[PDB]
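Thread: iron/sulfur cluster complex, take 2
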Amino acid sequence: MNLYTVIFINILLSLTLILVAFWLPQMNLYSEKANPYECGFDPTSSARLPFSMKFFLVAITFLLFDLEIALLLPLPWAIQTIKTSTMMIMAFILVTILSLGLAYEWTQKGLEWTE
Amino acid sequence: TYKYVNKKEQESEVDMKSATDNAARILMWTELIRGLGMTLSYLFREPATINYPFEKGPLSPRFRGEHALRRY
Amino acid sequence: MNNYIFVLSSLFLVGCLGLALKPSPIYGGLGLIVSGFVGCLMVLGFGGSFLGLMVFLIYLGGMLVVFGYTTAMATEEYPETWGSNWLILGFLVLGVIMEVFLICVLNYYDEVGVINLDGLGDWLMYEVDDVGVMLEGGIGVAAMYSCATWMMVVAGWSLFAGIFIIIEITRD
Amino acid sequence: RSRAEYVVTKLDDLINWARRSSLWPMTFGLACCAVEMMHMAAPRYDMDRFGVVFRASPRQADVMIVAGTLTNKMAPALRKVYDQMPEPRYVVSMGSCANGGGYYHYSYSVVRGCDRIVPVDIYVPGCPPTAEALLYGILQLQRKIKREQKLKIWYRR
Amino acid sequence: MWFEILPGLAIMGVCLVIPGVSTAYIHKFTNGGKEKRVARVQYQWYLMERDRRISGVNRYYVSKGLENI
Amino acid sequence: AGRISAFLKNAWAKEPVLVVSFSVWGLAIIMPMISPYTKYASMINKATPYNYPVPVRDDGNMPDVPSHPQDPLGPSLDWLKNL
Amino acid sequence: MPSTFFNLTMAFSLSLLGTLMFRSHLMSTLLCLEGMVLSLFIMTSVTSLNSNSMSSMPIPITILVFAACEAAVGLALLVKVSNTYGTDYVQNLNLLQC
Amino acid sequence: MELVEVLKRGVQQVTGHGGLRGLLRVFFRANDIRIGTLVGEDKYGNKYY
Amino acid sequence: MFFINILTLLVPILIAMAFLTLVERKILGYMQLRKGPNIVGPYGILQPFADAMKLFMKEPMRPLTTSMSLFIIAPTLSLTLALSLWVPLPMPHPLINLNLGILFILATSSLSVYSILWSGWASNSKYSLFGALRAVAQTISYEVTMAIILLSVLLMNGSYSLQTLITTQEHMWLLLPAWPMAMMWFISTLAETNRAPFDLTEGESELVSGFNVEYAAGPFALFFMAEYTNIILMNALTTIIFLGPLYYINLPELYSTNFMMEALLLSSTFLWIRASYPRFRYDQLMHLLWKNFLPLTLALCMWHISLPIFTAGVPPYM
Ligand SMILES: CCCCCCCCCCCCO[C@@H]1O[C@H](CO)[C@@H](O[C@H]2O[C@H](CO)[C@@H](O)[C@H](O)[C@H]2O)[C@H](O)[C@H]1O
Ligand SMILES: CCCCCCCCCCCCO[C@@H]1O[C@H](CO)[C@@H](O[C@H]2O[C@H](CO)[C@@H](O)[C@H](O)[C@H]2O)[C@H](O)[C@H]1O
Ligand SMILES: CCCCCCCCCCCCO[C@@H]1O[C@H](CO)[C@@H](O[C@H]2O[C@H](CO)[C@@H](O)[C@H](O)[C@H]2O)[C@H](O)[C@H]1O
Ligand code: SF4
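Output below.
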């Protein structure tokens, strides 16, 4: 109950500041004020057009590496096992293959951003 | 007469000593620590700020300011 | 508090309805983040802890990549929201109405079958070992390191092979 | 006057003090006059000790300091970034070029004073004004803001 | 001079001690003068619930010694 | 093996991070195999009693099972007390 | 439990309906697959907790591991589609009718 | 030891402005509590140090 | 009483944040041979309040190209998450005692990036989109190693509970056995807080103001309040993990005083670092993390699995 209570208060405080910030100040809306900023000149296109991602391969590698750490985060419970040798070999093998995967991608220039 | 600003390319062999000194410099961020030392040394220096408008920047008799018309 | 888990599973249902309508993937990505959070709460509510926090953490990472991919490869001049198209909005409202109807009718016909609005909160936790110590879900997951090592061998291989797979797919 | 008028007057002071004490100019400089603006930020004068902080975004700026010559080609862009400052906003015209065209007043390519493009609160003379002369003008803007009576005028409407 | 930075630091320092100190004192005030009980595992929760049930006042932190048997 | 020594020396000067990573990885594998304390880690996990030790019915043919927890029979923990 | 599992199965059905009823973006469909994965994760996790089946808790984690591999391949394919056509629209992927 | 010298100069600055009111006046008007030699005063009341 | 305890956490943390804006500006000033604020209040101690009042009295932007729901939500989410990160912190007793408090921190911190991503996207301007896509890259850079660094440390803790770290360090800072991870952890918290030399999502010399460029007035203040609150949080976390403040069961306030001193010091080094270095290029941050930290982090994770087994030093479960 307590965790729910404090997070609601955190939400409540943030939303109150937003309401104050939008209803206290004097406003003056006109078109030139609300147009998008681009260093004093008009944009030549939408900001909604495609924006190329040069690190796209690192990005999807990160998806796999993020499930690798998910497999590592039970380790504090796993070190309590009687089967210490089995746990240790499994953890060593898991870390080593992930290193080999990173090493391969590194030597394939998979960490280099595209030009 | 001229001098080279970045021609220190007398490539030499590396001992264990120098390789370890290079290793320590990379792994322990030693030149980055020297940067922090410099900014730390300024922290304890007296600032150059004057208390304008109670204090003023020095000027000279030649200073060119607001015009006036004079008399005898 | 007797309605707590039903409310959460009801929120989860709405999130998947929003995703199913497929607005711009920007809002689809947001829909999965909220559903992931609601899904974490349900796992917690049933006595979970590690599993709920894992799936939220994994989906927080997963949708960040999808955000990056969306801005590069799945964007239009006017990205669609749930309200932008009257047809999508209507099926959002109709879908929510059909949820209330489906739960209402099923409650009437059986009363204790799939829907048991009279008994909500009485059948969440069934048995609990009151004086136990080693019971948290992380202990169960950790059996991959000792008793279920085959599960970890296949999981590790798929991530390892995945690196070689995605490098091959993406090279020109 | 009344206690409701006294309270309104003290509130004017408080909001005025807040805007005096946190003036954020745009990172915006046109020519040689901008060099003296750098010297006002530099350690001797340290504008930041008065609460004056450059921000690059017009959305996060309160003051525009027109620090240099305003050409015809630049005029629409200067008007754009002025319009994109949220209010309340202020303009300081700095130096002869911005004040009225200066050395280039008679040029085909120059706007004869930025006050043909934006409203101006303070005119700082000089070519360039010294860093200290600019600082004096900034402190004159603060005293102008100290005189604002927007809540008192609202009350008497 | 650098030591003029300290008024802000002291205000920061005071503000960062209050949360730790206030939480420790409010716990003792609301837990019968003792540390708030930590129930990491179900066994600890069971002991608290048993303490609440035998307390006579529905408070786990009101303890009963040999005077009760 | 003078060619490798120059190789390793250059790698140390120029790629020390990778040299440390491989050395640490190799040490982590080696150390459990040569350490005299490796055997105790499993024994300590085995001596932690998370569950109630259910007693056994005495059939008269259990010379090795203690009848009381302070009998001198059963597993001793003196090794851990003086570890 | 009864009502929660009904709602979770409905959540899977909606995500599958989303998968089966394409709009234009391939990425929107890839998100629907992640929705089905998410529903199945919670269903497996809640079942294991409700039955106190601690030996089955590895299985929900393995569901996410292979789903991550499936999602990574899906995104990798989507890069290829976008490179060919400049969008991820599925109507362009029609050369194999003849 | 040298710290004590510094703190004593702080006591001179803090008590050398004409009591508490005089210290508050200069501290809040000028944001400075240094003591200097009085060089003079003009007819308007400005004091030069 | 629990509501009073919420106040005596949130309010002092928000005042500590406000005065960190003052301390930063004075420390940076003095390292630059300036003074910084010394007029608005005695020694500038009212300057934060003036900036706060100014911003909330300013007209907030309603740009025309903006998608307004996410535009409002993102700064709201930013401050909520920043405040929420404090509730499980044991100083030495937390407001909320969590069994997996470290995992709570990672999940909450990981949701915090979406405030940057959505604000930049929702603003629908080019410089804000640039800032959002740098946040995508930033998280990919550091999040890959931050959890493994934590994992290795907590194999000496034996749990994800923050309060257990106090007992783990009863006789020694975790810095001593884990200083190489502490170094990598410290760089990660700089990137995690978008602080210099990794202040890339804002990076004003390149993107004007990046993700928040279209934001004005009070909504802008929420991002700033959230950033300065997080700086204190991450350093307080570094203090509890690696610099175990002295704990005595009969003198809890001693822990709080020692905690504050070390946390104040670690926050000062954040401001000191900002004054000293140039900015990374955002592709270079990715290479720093993935080609230097990640190899060593993986080796050290293997070493810290190996260590408790071969020294028989497995920490207790409870
Ligand atoms: C291709 C991937 C390659 C990377 C993977 C390599 C994995 C190989 C690991 C080799 C190291 C195994 O190290 C092994 O550790 C175990 C405990 O863990 C030690 O085992 C020792 O202690 C255990 C307790 O834990 C006792 O029960 C056992 O009788 C005793 O032998 C072994 O003596 C040692 O040989
Ligand atoms: C997206 C959000 C969706 C919100 C969904 C709706 C939330 C509200 C749930 C309503 C369902 C029934 O909710 C509530 O269930 C409890 C069981 O716990 C019933 O329980 C109570 O009333 C019924 C008889 O009327 C009996 O069981 C008993 O007298 C008492 O326990 C309540 O009468 C009913 O109102
Ligand atoms: C072609 C590719 C496949 C080859 C590569 C994979 C090689 C196999 C490696 C995984 C080995 C798993 O090895 C298997 O481990 C399990 C525990 O996990 C052991 O299981 C044993 O202990 C468990 C503990 O609960 C008992 O319940 C079980 O009855 C008993 O058999 C098996 O006896 C052993 O066969
Ligand atoms: S007024 Fe003088 S100094 Fe300023 S921009 Fe013009 S020419 Fe240069």
